[PDB]
Design a protein around this ligand. Structure first.
Ligand code: ZN
Ligand code: ZN
Ligand code: ZN
Ligand code: ZN
Lengths: 47, 47
């Protein structure tokens, strides 16, 4: 059971943007809207 | 900037289901699919 990113439709929402205060996907951080934001892992990252 | 629940379309995704490993909304925990799950707050809850 996963949430998928609205923009990156094949990516799982697995991180949290601490700057915007919104869960996001890895590609949103690598290339996308949160590229310069501080992020945290969601538990799924280290399970 | 917020993610909204797919089922509870007026609710913000502001909690994390630790049991299912998926971000969710409060109503999913109070009444919905994650009612018997263990949950955690997302940072937005205590900002
Ligand atoms: Zn994305
Ligand atoms: Zn951001
Ligand atoms: Zn919900
Ligand atoms: Zn659950």
């Amino acid at each position: 059971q996963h949430l998928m990113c609205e923009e990156h439709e094949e990516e799982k929402i697995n991180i949290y943007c601490l700057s915007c205060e919104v869960p996001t996907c890895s590609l949103c951080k690598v290339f996308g809207a949160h590229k310069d934001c501080e992020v945290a892992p969601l538990p799924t990252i280290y399970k």
